[PDB]
Enzyme design. Structure first.
Site, PDB file in Angstrom:
ATOM      1  N   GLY A  17       0.781  -1.222   0.000  1.00 38.22           N
ATOM      2  CA  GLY A  17       0.000   0.000   0.000  1.00 38.22           C
ATOM      3  C   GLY A  17       0.814   1.273   0.000  1.00 38.22           C
ATOM      4  N   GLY A  19       1.503   4.702   2.023  1.00 40.89           N
ATOM      5  CA  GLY A  19       1.337   5.238   3.356  1.00 40.89           C
ATOM      6  C   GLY A  19       1.653   6.712   3.399  1.00 40.89           C
ATOM      7  CB  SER A  20       1.618   9.191   6.143  1.00 37.24           C
ATOM      8  OG  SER A  20       0.202   9.238   6.254  1.00 37.24           O
ATOM      9  CB  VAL A  24       3.216   0.204   3.585  1.00 33.70           C
ATOM     10  CG1 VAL A  24       3.321  -0.859   4.675  1.00 33.70           C
ATOM     11  CG2 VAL A  24       3.032   1.590   4.194  1.00 33.70           C
ATOM     12  CE  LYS A  39       4.250   4.854   7.313  1.00 32.93           C
ATOM     13  NZ  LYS A  39       3.687   6.135   7.843  1.00 32.93           N
ATOM     14  CE1 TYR A  87       0.718  -7.778   5.788  1.00 32.71           C
ATOM     15  CE2 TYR A  87      -0.171  -9.624   7.032  1.00 32.71           C
ATOM     16  CZ  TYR A  87      -0.098  -8.888   5.865  1.00 32.71           C
ATOM     17  OH  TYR A  87      -0.836  -9.282   4.774  1.00 32.71           O
ATOM     18  CG  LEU A  88      -2.114  -4.740  11.864  1.00 37.86           C
ATOM     19  CD1 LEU A  88      -2.391  -3.324  12.343  1.00 37.86           C
ATOM     20  CD2 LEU A  88      -2.639  -5.773  12.855  1.00 37.86           C
ATOM     21  CG  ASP A 130      -5.373  11.814   9.738  1.00 40.75           C
ATOM     22  OD1 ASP A 130      -6.484  12.300   9.427  1.00 40.75           O
ATOM     23  OD2 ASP A 130      -4.566  11.374   8.880  1.00 40.75           O
TER      24      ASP A 130
HETATM   25  C1  H1N Z   1      -2.311   4.488   7.931  1.00 39.33           C
HETATM   26  C2  H1N Z   1      -1.689   3.513   6.928  1.00 39.33           C
HETATM   27  S1  H1N Z   1       0.126   3.731   6.790  1.00 39.33           S
HETATM   28  O1  H1N Z   1       0.524   5.285   6.836  1.00 39.33           O
HETATM   29  O2  H1N Z   1       0.545   3.068   5.400  1.00 39.33           O
HETATM   30  N1  H1N Z   1       0.851   2.913   8.105  1.00 39.33           N
HETATM   31  C3  H1N Z   1       0.836   1.560   8.339  1.00 39.33           C
HETATM   32  C4  H1N Z   1       1.362   1.047   9.544  1.00 39.33           C
HETATM   33  C5  H1N Z   1       1.380  -0.321   9.834  1.00 39.33           C
HETATM   34  C6  H1N Z   1       0.838  -1.190   8.885  1.00 39.33           C
HETATM   35  C7  H1N Z   1       0.294  -0.764   7.664  1.00 39.33           C
HETATM   36  C8  H1N Z   1       0.291   0.640   7.391  1.00 39.33           C
HETATM   37  C9  H1N Z   1      -0.141  -1.935   6.998  1.00 39.33           C
HETATM   38  C10 H1N Z   1      -0.927  -2.110   5.903  1.00 39.33           C
HETATM   39  N2  H1N Z   1      -1.315  -3.386   5.595  1.00 39.33           N
HETATM   40  C11 H1N Z   1      -1.996  -3.981   4.556  1.00 39.33           C
HETATM   41  C12 H1N Z   1      -2.625  -3.324   3.472  1.00 39.33           C
HETATM   42  C13 H1N Z   1      -3.287  -4.053   2.477  1.00 39.33           C
HETATM   43  C14 H1N Z   1      -3.358  -5.457   2.528  1.00 39.33           C
HETATM   44  C15 H1N Z   1      -4.068  -6.216   1.463  1.00 39.33           C
HETATM   45  N3  H1N Z   1      -5.561  -6.400   1.575  1.00 39.33           N
HETATM   46  C16 H1N Z   1      -5.871  -6.914   2.953  1.00 39.33           C
HETATM   47  C17 H1N Z   1      -7.360  -7.241   3.189  1.00 39.33           C
HETATM   48  C18 H1N Z   1      -7.781  -8.354   2.219  1.00 39.33           C
HETATM   49  C19 H1N Z   1      -7.522  -7.879   0.776  1.00 39.33           C
HETATM   50  C20 H1N Z   1      -6.097  -7.328   0.528  1.00 39.33           C
HETATM   51  C21 H1N Z   1      -2.727  -6.121   3.609  1.00 39.33           C
HETATM   52  C22 H1N Z   1      -2.064  -5.389   4.605  1.00 39.33           C
HETATM   53  C23 H1N Z   1      -1.360  -1.018   5.158  1.00 39.33           C
HETATM   54  C24 H1N Z   1      -0.525  -0.474   4.146  1.00 39.33           C
HETATM   55  C25 H1N Z   1      -0.958   0.641   3.401  1.00 39.33           C
HETATM   56  C26 H1N Z   1      -2.216   1.212   3.661  1.00 39.33           C
HETATM   57  C27 H1N Z   1      -3.050   0.684   4.664  1.00 39.33           C
HETATM   58  C28 H1N Z   1      -2.624  -0.426   5.413  1.00 39.33           C
HETATM   59  C29 H1N Z   1       0.187  -2.973   7.876  1.00 39.33           C
HETATM   60  O3  H1N Z   1       0.019  -4.218   7.745  1.00 39.33           O
HETATM   61  N4  H1N Z   1       0.763  -2.508   8.978  1.00 39.33           N
END
Ligand code: H1N
Length: 285
Positions: A17, A19-20, A24, A39, A87-88, A130
């Protein structure tokens, strides 16, 4: 407490994804073989946001809560910073809205966990600033955590309020927009908007240009939850969305709200929402 050579301890996998401040990636902890999120920030292009990047790391490093994304550490590698986090695999609550409406058990369950995160942050004199569904992340088994601390604020013995204009306009409290002296009650307003977002799919004014909402939010009466929703859910939203911050309940108080007590259930049931999204995404053209 910056660390070095992250690839000795972690393996960087594919992008998952935006991120800010950066992208990520999925990663692996080579010690445990658990999956992590990484990130990656390009500090060479990080002109100005550098202060917020620093704040994100500082705030993350100071949190130890099941309701806040766990922090493994920050590593320098050439011009890039690796911020290693929990990881989420369920992604964000925002994404999980895409296939269609939530029911009130899902809304209550998610709000309850957000409230536990806010209770933790506010007790640590931290303000998230936020709060919105995009910054609410789920594990693949339905656990819920707050994320993105780049604009978080810290109260101290010499600074009992903040006044910085930060957040995402549709979710911002009126006193933040006006840059009055504000505190954790600003998060409670944003929580109210997020409750509407979870119930209806979008925050109030979502069709309008963000600059318009910057004058509408202080000008207008607070939003209410309209539609066929239970009285306690409407009253939960109304309690949060008071123009006077001191009349808003605390996170601790909202955890006792009738809407939460009557409707929140086991977090593991939220896996249904993750499966719904996987099915929806796989069919999507
Ligand atoms: C507020 C989002 S951020 O600034 O990117 N920070 C952050 C911090 C910790 C994280 C994450 C982001 C993720 C993170 N994890 C994540 C994002 C997308 C998936 C894929 N999807 C998962 C749900 C089923 C269909 C496919 C799996 C994991 C994430 C990245 C980017 C945007 C939103 C969420 C994670 O697993 N841990």
């Amino acid at each position: 407490n910056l660390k070095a050579d992250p690839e000795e301890l972690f393996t960087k996998l594919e992008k998952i994804g935006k991120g800010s401040f950066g992208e990520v990636f999925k990663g692996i902890d080579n010690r445990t073989q658990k999956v992590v999120a990484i990130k990656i920030i390009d500090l060479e292009e990080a002109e100005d946001e550098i202060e917020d990047i620093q704040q994100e790391i500082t705030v993350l490093s100071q949190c130890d809560s099941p309701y806040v994304t766990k922090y493994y550490g920050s590593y320098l590698k050439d011009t890039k910073l690796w911020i290693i986090m929990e990881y989420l695999g369920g992604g964000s609550a925002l994404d999980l809205l895409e296939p269609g409406p939530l029911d009130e058990t899902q809304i209550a369950t998610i709000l309850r966990e957000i409230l536990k995160g806010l209770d933790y942050l506010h007790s640590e004199k931290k303000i998230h600033r936020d709060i919105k569904a995009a910054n609410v992340l789920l594990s693949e088994h339905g656990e819920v955590k707050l994320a993105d601390f780049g604009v978080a604020g810290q109260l101290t013995d010499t600074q009992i309020k903040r006044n910085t204009f930060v957040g995402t306009p549709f979710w911002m409290a009126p006193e933040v927009i006006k840059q009055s002296a504000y505190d954790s009650k600003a998060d409670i307003w944003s929580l109210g908007i997020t409750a509407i977002e979870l119930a209806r799919g979008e925050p109030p004014h979502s069709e309008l240009h963000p600059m318009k909402v910057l004058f509408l939010i202080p000008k207008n009466n607070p939003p209410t939850l309209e539609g066929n929703y239970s009285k306690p859910l409407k009253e939960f939203v109304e309690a949060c969305l008071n123009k006077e911050p001191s009349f808003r309940p605390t996170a601790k108080e909202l955890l006792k709200h009738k809407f939460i007590l009557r409707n929140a259930k086991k977090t593991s049931y939220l896996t249904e929402l993750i499966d719904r999204y996987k099915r929806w995404k796989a069919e999507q053209s």
